[PDB]
From a paper:
Further combining the substitutions resulted in a triple mutant, K224R/G232A/N233Q, which is as active as the wild-type enzyme in hydrolyzing AMP but exhibits a 600-fold reduction in kcat/KM for IMP hydrolysis. In order to understand the basis for its altered substrate specificity, the structure of the triple mutant was determined by X-ray crystallography to 1.75 Å resolution with four molecules in the asymmetric unit. In each chain of NDM-1 K224R/G232A/N233Q, there are zinc ions coordinated to the histidine site and cysteine site. A water molecule or hydroxide ion was found between the two zinc ions in each chain. The K224R/G232A/N233Q mutations do not result in large changes in the overall structure of NDM-1 but do cause a large change in the conformation of loop L10 where the mutations occur. Specifically, although the side chain of Arg224 in NDM-1 K224R/G232A/N233Q chain A has a similar orientation as that of Lys224 in the wild-type protein, the side chain of Gln233 in the mutant adopts a very different orientation from that of Asn233 in the wild-type enzyme and is pointed out of the active site. The main chain conformation of the triple mutant is drastically altered between Ala232 and Asp236. This has the effect of placing the side chain of Leu234 of the mutant in the position of Asn233 in wild-type and the side chain of Gln233 of the mutant in the position of Leu234 in wild-type. As Asn233 in wild-type NDM-1 is predicted to form a hydrogen bond with the carboxylate group of the reaction intermediate of β-lactams, this interaction would be abolished in the K224R/G232A/N233Q mutant, with the Asn233 hydrogen-bonding group replaced by the Leu234 hydrophobic group. In addition, the methyl group of Ala232 in the mutant protein protrudes toward the active site, which may cause steric clash with β-lactams with bulky R2 groups such as cephalosporins and carbapenems.
As a broad spectrum and readily transferable MBL, NDM-1 confers resistance to nearly all β-lactam antibiotics in a wide range of Gram-negative pathogens. NDM-1 has broad specificity with kcat/KM values of 106–107 M−1 s−1 for hydrolysis of penicillins, cephalosporins, and carbapenems. Other than the ligands for the active site Zn ions, the active site of NDM-1 is composed largely of hydrophobic residues. Lys224 and Asn233 are the only residues that make polar interactions with the antibiotic substrate.
Residue numbers in the entry:
A (entry chain D), C (entry chain A): 34 to 104, 107 to 130, 132 to 151, 160 to 183, 186 to 208, 215 to 266, 296 to 312
B (entry chain C): 37 to 104, 107 to 130, 132 to 151, 160 to 183, 186 to 208, 215 to 266, 296 to 312
Write the structure that this text describes.
Amino acid sequence: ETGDQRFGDLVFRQLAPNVWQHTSYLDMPGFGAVASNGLIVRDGGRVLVVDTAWTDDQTAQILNWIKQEINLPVALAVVTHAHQDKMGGMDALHAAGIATYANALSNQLAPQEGMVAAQHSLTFAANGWVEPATAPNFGPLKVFYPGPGHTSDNITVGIDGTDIAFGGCLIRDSKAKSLAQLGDADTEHYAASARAFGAAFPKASMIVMSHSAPDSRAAITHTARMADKLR
Amino acid sequence: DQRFGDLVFRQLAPNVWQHTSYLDMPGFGAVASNGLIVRDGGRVLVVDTAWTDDQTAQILNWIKQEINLPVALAVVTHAHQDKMGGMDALHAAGIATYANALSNQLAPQEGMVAAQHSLTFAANGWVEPATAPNFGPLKVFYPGPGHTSDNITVGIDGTDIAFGGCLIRDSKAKSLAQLGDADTEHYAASARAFGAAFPKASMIVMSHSAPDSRAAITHTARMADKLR
Amino acid sequence: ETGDQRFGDLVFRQLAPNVWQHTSYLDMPGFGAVASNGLIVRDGGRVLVVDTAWTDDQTAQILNWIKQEINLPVALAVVTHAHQDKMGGMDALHAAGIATYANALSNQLAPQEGMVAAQHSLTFAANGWVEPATAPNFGPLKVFYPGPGHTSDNITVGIDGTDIAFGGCLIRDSKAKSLAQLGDADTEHYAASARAFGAAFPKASMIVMSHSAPDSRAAITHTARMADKLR
Ligand SMILES: [Cl-]
Ligand code: NA
Ligand SMILES: [Zn+2]
Ligand SMILES: [Zn+2]
Ligand SMILES: [Zn+2]
Ligand SMILES: [Zn+2]
Ligand SMILES: [Zn+2]
Ligand SMILES: [Zn+2]
């Protein structure tokens, strides 16, 4: 697609002057290639990454692309929950010397899920905002825990200076037929958590998510309505 | 057993009592919920409120009569009415209250009053000590999502007792009785993590069964395997 | 039965001058009491116990019966696998200061079974006989691991100087209609393990077992034949 950059088996799409979406694919029975999206953010003289690819090899390719297209050191990465599409490439981040951050709950779940925990645990205030001492020097990344939904540990990220907020796997596109939630979903609170994401980033007009192309805020209201059906 | 008003108290160890309160739940009838009272030197520690403020005040008045030591702090194990229904009674009495940060985030949505203090947890599940000041023998462990996303558990140092709250059901239970806020994927691992956090505990106290052996942990984990 | 002795919820039957069988019961609602048998052995001025009762309180009843009726200290207990009927009372032994022994695998399985591990681990040679250094001062107790059957960890015990051998839950009543084997039974090897128990204690004429009264060697051959029907 126009605006998409193929790089090995990954796809990169510039979303804003300092923001790109990375996309990697995992082959799954019945579906073929399943895409997962993350973000790359240029912040002055460094790069920040949100979410790995499905695998270490793919995540190394993200770092390779950053070297080629941006040529600035990757300072830190934040992963948004303990599923393979978000934390599958933690090893490649650590081998590159990148400081990694995740919800403390994500780090506690990672071993059970067969993932590597991030090096640092984020903790959150009772109002959902990250405790700033657990997320030092995050630059424009505003990390918000909306409550359980897609998973108990899912977190979300707004990018200061842009119209962009990343709902991860919590938010689905405005035309999604289902939420694709599984047994680790909290179907009682999912709707309120989706709405709390909307409220935490009320001005964001481009909503980026893991398994759909970027959408309008209609993705948030649609997701919450579909989640209403689950309660 | 001992009675103050509508509350029942059962001594479990020299310094530990179980408190039991009841609420009529549409269909089920009178549902019991258990919490703990711990005497620790010159003070008393409470785990979980009763279903209501009035019932929780009854706990506080039994403590004053039978123990006659001030209640230093209370910890609540998740944002459901049987564990946090009586928060206002604790705050009216000047008691410092603690809950998982996530429990305090959920409390408004659940129609609960939030605790005054938020507990946070290391990646290994043990509470960050700075967030649980002066908990004495209370060893607070977050086992992972199960009954709810926010459920926490507590062992009593120097006793055989560990409190699984609503995560653990007794060895004769037929089901977990979990709802939409349960995590059926991780429930079994969380039950097993609770057992591993308090591996020497021989009396397992829980919210909706009388105290049981470690068979309650194993049975709960086996039932949880069947929801995965 | 004639000659049996009651203490609380337990029944004791003298089998030989220096050997008693202890029987405890577990209430299975709608099914009645499930009996489990173990052994008590007088060896000079000390007593040796094979298997606990189902619970700590029942096992304390065993210890009190020993004190009252034999009045010799219990030096050690050996438990024959990690099921409630054999290890359910470990805490009662430890509280009384009795040294406890089990197959290393039984001790490894105990935590996940909700049991308390024994203090000491037995290990076994390739021929099934216990490594003597791991079973110090066992006196007349001859411990044999016959291979997987009832469980992977089940062990068996002969009593030197008597005609008695204890098959635990591996050997079943010669009138049994089924093995009552569960998910942790090894049905490929069960028959060979029962036969190995018979060959390890070839002169034993009284076969004591966990869930029926003492039998002849027919209990061994019948059990092996029942297991043959499952290979
Ligand atoms: Cl995953
Ligand atoms: Na025990
Ligand atoms: Zn996910
Ligand atoms: Zn996803
Ligand atoms: Zn609950
Ligand atoms: Zn409950
Ligand atoms: Zn058995
Ligand atoms: Zn048995």
